[PDB]
Amino acid sequence: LVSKLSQLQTELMAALLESGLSKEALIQALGEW
Amino acid sequence: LVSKLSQLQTELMAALLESGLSKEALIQALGEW
């Protein structure tokens, strides 16, 4: 049902956050909008 | 110089954005702060 890409993106984000991803990195990414 | 973890995080975020990561996914992640 759920696309492999969606699952992979969710898994990647989760893993990145747990690795200590900074809020600044997220803010910069959010900046694309 | 730059840690392998930092480089990997930067590379991962970049790849995720290019794969079509949504702003909602970023907002939710940013929410942890």
Short mmCIF file of N, CA, C and O in Angstrom, two decimals:
data_model
loop_
_atom_site.label_atom_id
_atom_site.label_comp_id
_atom_site.label_asym_id
_atom_site.label_seq_id
_atom_site.Cartn_x
_atom_site.Cartn_y
_atom_site.Cartn_z
N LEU A 1 0.85 -1.21 0.00
CA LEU A 1 0.00 0.00 0.00
C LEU A 1 0.87 1.25 0.00
O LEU A 1 0.94 1.97 -0.99
N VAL A 2 1.54 1.49 1.12
CA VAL A 2 2.41 2.65 1.24
C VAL A 2 3.59 2.47 0.29
O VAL A 2 4.16 1.39 0.21
N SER A 3 3.96 3.53 -0.42
CA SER A 3 5.06 3.42 -1.37
C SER A 3 6.38 3.18 -0.64
O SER A 3 6.56 3.61 0.51
N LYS A 4 7.29 2.49 -1.32
CA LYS A 4 8.60 2.19 -0.76
C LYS A 4 9.34 3.51 -0.49
O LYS A 4 10.06 3.63 0.50
N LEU A 5 9.16 4.48 -1.38
CA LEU A 5 9.82 5.78 -1.22
C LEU A 5 9.35 6.48 0.06
O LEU A 5 10.16 7.06 0.79
N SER A 6 8.04 6.43 0.32
CA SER A 6 7.49 7.06 1.51
C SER A 6 8.05 6.42 2.77
O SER A 6 8.47 7.11 3.70
N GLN A 7 8.04 5.10 2.80
CA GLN A 7 8.55 4.36 3.95
C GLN A 7 10.03 4.69 4.17
O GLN A 7 10.46 4.91 5.29
N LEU A 8 10.79 4.72 3.08
CA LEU A 8 12.21 5.02 3.17
C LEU A 8 12.46 6.44 3.70
O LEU A 8 13.38 6.66 4.49
N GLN A 9 11.65 7.39 3.25
CA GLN A 9 11.80 8.77 3.70
C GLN A 9 11.50 8.89 5.18
O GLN A 9 12.21 9.58 5.92
N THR A 10 10.45 8.21 5.63
CA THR A 10 10.06 8.24 7.04
C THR A 10 11.15 7.59 7.90
O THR A 10 11.51 8.11 8.97
N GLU A 11 11.69 6.48 7.42
CA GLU A 11 12.74 5.75 8.11
C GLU A 11 14.02 6.59 8.20
O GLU A 11 14.70 6.60 9.23
N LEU A 12 14.36 7.25 7.10
CA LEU A 12 15.56 8.08 7.02
C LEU A 12 15.46 9.29 7.96
O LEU A 12 16.40 9.58 8.71
N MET A 13 14.34 10.00 7.91
CA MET A 13 14.17 11.15 8.79
C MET A 13 14.30 10.71 10.23
O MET A 13 15.02 11.33 11.01
N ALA A 14 13.59 9.65 10.60
CA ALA A 14 13.66 9.15 11.97
C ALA A 14 15.10 8.85 12.39
O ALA A 14 15.54 9.26 13.47
N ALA A 15 15.82 8.13 11.55
CA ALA A 15 17.21 7.79 11.85
C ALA A 15 18.09 9.03 11.95
O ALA A 15 18.97 9.10 12.80
N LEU A 16 17.86 10.00 11.07
CA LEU A 16 18.65 11.23 11.09
C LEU A 16 18.43 11.98 12.39
O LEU A 16 19.38 12.48 12.99
N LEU A 17 17.19 12.08 12.83
CA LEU A 17 16.91 12.79 14.07
C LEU A 17 17.62 12.11 15.24
O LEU A 17 18.25 12.78 16.06
N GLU A 18 17.53 10.78 15.30
CA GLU A 18 18.16 10.06 16.39
C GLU A 18 19.68 10.18 16.38
O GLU A 18 20.32 10.03 17.42
N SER A 19 20.26 10.45 15.21
CA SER A 19 21.72 10.59 15.11
C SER A 19 22.17 11.96 15.60
O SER A 19 23.37 12.27 15.60
N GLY A 20 21.22 12.78 16.02
CA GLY A 20 21.54 14.10 16.52
C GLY A 20 21.42 15.25 15.54
O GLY A 20 22.06 16.29 15.72
N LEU A 21 20.60 15.08 14.50
CA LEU A 21 20.39 16.12 13.50
C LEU A 21 20.00 17.41 14.21
O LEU A 21 19.18 17.39 15.12
N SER A 22 20.58 18.53 13.79
CA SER A 22 20.29 19.81 14.42
C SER A 22 19.05 20.51 13.88
O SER A 22 18.63 20.28 12.74
N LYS A 23 18.47 21.38 14.72
CA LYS A 23 17.30 22.13 14.33
C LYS A 23 17.69 23.11 13.23
O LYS A 23 16.87 23.46 12.39
N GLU A 24 18.94 23.56 13.24
CA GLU A 24 19.38 24.48 12.20
C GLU A 24 19.35 23.80 10.83
O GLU A 24 19.00 24.42 9.84
N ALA A 25 19.72 22.52 10.79
CA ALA A 25 19.70 21.79 9.53
C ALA A 25 18.27 21.66 9.02
O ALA A 25 18.02 21.71 7.81
N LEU A 26 17.31 21.51 9.93
CA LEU A 26 15.91 21.38 9.56
C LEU A 26 15.34 22.72 9.10
O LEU A 26 14.57 22.79 8.12
N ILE A 27 15.73 23.78 9.79
CA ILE A 27 15.27 25.12 9.45
C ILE A 27 15.76 25.49 8.06
O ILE A 27 15.02 26.06 7.26
N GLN A 28 17.01 25.16 7.77
CA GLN A 28 17.59 25.47 6.47
C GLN A 28 16.83 24.71 5.38
O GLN A 28 16.53 25.26 4.33
N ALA A 29 16.54 23.44 5.63
CA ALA A 29 15.80 22.63 4.66
C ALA A 29 14.40 23.20 4.47
O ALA A 29 13.91 23.33 3.34
N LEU A 30 13.74 23.55 5.57
CA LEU A 30 12.40 24.11 5.52
C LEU A 30 12.41 25.40 4.72
O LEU A 30 11.41 25.80 4.13
N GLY A 31 13.57 26.06 4.70
CA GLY A 31 13.71 27.30 3.98
C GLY A 31 13.41 27.21 2.50
O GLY A 31 13.10 28.23 1.87
N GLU A 32 13.50 26.02 1.92
CA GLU A 32 13.23 25.87 0.49
C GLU A 32 11.79 26.24 0.13
O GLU A 32 11.45 26.37 -1.04
N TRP A 33 10.95 26.41 1.14
CA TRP A 33 9.56 26.78 0.89
C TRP A 33 9.30 28.23 1.26
O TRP A 33 10.25 28.92 1.67
N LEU B 1 38.90 16.35 8.67
CA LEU B 1 38.47 17.50 9.51
C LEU B 1 37.00 17.34 9.89
O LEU B 1 36.68 17.09 11.05
N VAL B 2 36.12 17.49 8.92
CA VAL B 2 34.69 17.36 9.16
C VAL B 2 34.40 15.91 9.53
O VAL B 2 34.92 14.99 8.90
N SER B 3 33.57 15.70 10.55
CA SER B 3 33.26 14.34 10.97
C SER B 3 32.48 13.60 9.90
O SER B 3 31.73 14.21 9.12
N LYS B 4 32.66 12.29 9.86
CA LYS B 4 31.96 11.44 8.89
C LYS B 4 30.45 11.55 9.13
O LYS B 4 29.67 11.54 8.18
N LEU B 5 30.05 11.64 10.40
CA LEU B 5 28.64 11.75 10.74
C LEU B 5 28.03 13.02 10.16
O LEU B 5 26.92 13.01 9.63
N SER B 6 28.76 14.13 10.28
CA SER B 6 28.28 15.41 9.77
C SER B 6 28.10 15.35 8.26
O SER B 6 27.07 15.78 7.72
N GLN B 7 29.11 14.83 7.57
CA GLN B 7 29.06 14.72 6.12
C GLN B 7 27.88 13.83 5.71
O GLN B 7 27.15 14.15 4.77
N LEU B 8 27.71 12.72 6.41
CA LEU B 8 26.62 11.80 6.10
C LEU B 8 25.25 12.45 6.31
O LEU B 8 24.33 12.24 5.52
N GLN B 9 25.12 13.24 7.37
CA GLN B 9 23.86 13.91 7.65
C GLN B 9 23.54 14.93 6.57
O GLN B 9 22.40 15.03 6.12
N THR B 10 24.55 15.68 6.15
CA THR B 10 24.38 16.69 5.11
C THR B 10 23.99 16.03 3.78
O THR B 10 23.10 16.49 3.06
N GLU B 11 24.66 14.92 3.48
CA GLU B 11 24.41 14.17 2.25
C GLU B 11 23.00 13.57 2.25
O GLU B 11 22.31 13.57 1.23
N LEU B 12 22.59 13.04 3.40
CA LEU B 12 21.28 12.42 3.55
C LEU B 12 20.16 13.46 3.41
O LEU B 12 19.18 13.23 2.68
N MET B 13 20.28 14.58 4.11
CA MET B 13 19.27 15.62 4.01
C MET B 13 19.13 16.05 2.57
O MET B 13 18.03 16.15 2.04
N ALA B 14 20.26 16.35 1.93
CA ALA B 14 20.23 16.78 0.53
C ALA B 14 19.51 15.77 -0.36
O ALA B 14 18.64 16.14 -1.16
N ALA B 15 19.86 14.50 -0.22
CA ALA B 15 19.23 13.45 -1.01
C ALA B 15 17.74 13.33 -0.71
O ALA B 15 16.93 13.12 -1.62
N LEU B 16 17.37 13.46 0.55
CA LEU B 16 15.96 13.37 0.94
C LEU B 16 15.16 14.50 0.30
O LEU B 16 14.06 14.28 -0.20
N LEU B 17 15.70 15.71 0.33
CA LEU B 17 14.98 16.83 -0.26
C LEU B 17 14.77 16.59 -1.75
O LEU B 17 13.67 16.80 -2.26
N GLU B 18 15.81 16.15 -2.44
CA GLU B 18 15.71 15.92 -3.87
C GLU B 18 14.73 14.80 -4.21
O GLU B 18 14.18 14.77 -5.32
N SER B 19 14.50 13.88 -3.28
CA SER B 19 13.56 12.78 -3.52
C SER B 19 12.12 13.23 -3.36
O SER B 19 11.18 12.45 -3.52
N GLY B 20 11.94 14.51 -3.03
CA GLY B 20 10.60 15.05 -2.87
C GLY B 20 10.06 15.12 -1.46
O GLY B 20 8.84 15.15 -1.26
N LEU B 21 10.95 15.16 -0.47
CA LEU B 21 10.55 15.24 0.93
C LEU B 21 9.60 16.42 1.10
O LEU B 21 9.85 17.49 0.57
N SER B 22 8.52 16.23 1.85
CA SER B 22 7.54 17.29 2.04
C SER B 22 7.88 18.25 3.18
O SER B 22 8.61 17.90 4.11
N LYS B 23 7.33 19.46 3.08
CA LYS B 23 7.54 20.48 4.09
C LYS B 23 6.86 20.02 5.38
O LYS B 23 7.31 20.37 6.47
N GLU B 24 5.79 19.25 5.26
CA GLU B 24 5.11 18.78 6.46
C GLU B 24 6.01 17.84 7.25
O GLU B 24 6.02 17.86 8.47
N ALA B 25 6.79 17.02 6.54
CA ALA B 25 7.70 16.10 7.22
C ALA B 25 8.78 16.88 7.97
O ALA B 25 9.21 16.49 9.05
N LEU B 26 9.21 18.01 7.40
CA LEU B 26 10.23 18.85 8.01
C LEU B 26 9.66 19.59 9.22
O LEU B 26 10.32 19.72 10.27
N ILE B 27 8.43 20.08 9.08
CA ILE B 27 7.78 20.80 10.15
C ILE B 27 7.58 19.88 11.35
O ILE B 27 7.80 20.28 12.49
N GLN B 28 7.17 18.65 11.08
CA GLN B 28 6.96 17.68 12.15
C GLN B 28 8.28 17.41 12.87
O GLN B 28 8.32 17.34 14.10
N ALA B 29 9.35 17.24 12.11
CA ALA B 29 10.66 16.99 12.70
C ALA B 29 11.10 18.20 13.53
O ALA B 29 11.60 18.06 14.65
N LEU B 30 10.92 19.39 12.97
CA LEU B 30 11.29 20.62 13.66
C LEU B 30 10.51 20.73 14.96
O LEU B 30 10.96 21.37 15.92
N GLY B 31 9.34 20.11 14.98
CA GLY B 31 8.50 20.15 16.16
C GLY B 31 9.15 19.60 17.42
O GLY B 31 8.72 19.94 18.53
N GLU B 32 10.17 18.76 17.28
CA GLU B 32 10.83 18.19 18.45
C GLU B 32 11.48 19.26 19.32
O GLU B 32 11.90 18.99 20.44
N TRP B 33 11.57 20.48 18.80
CA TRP B 33 12.17 21.56 19.57
C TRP B 33 11.12 22.54 20.06
O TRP B 33 9.92 22.29 19.81
#
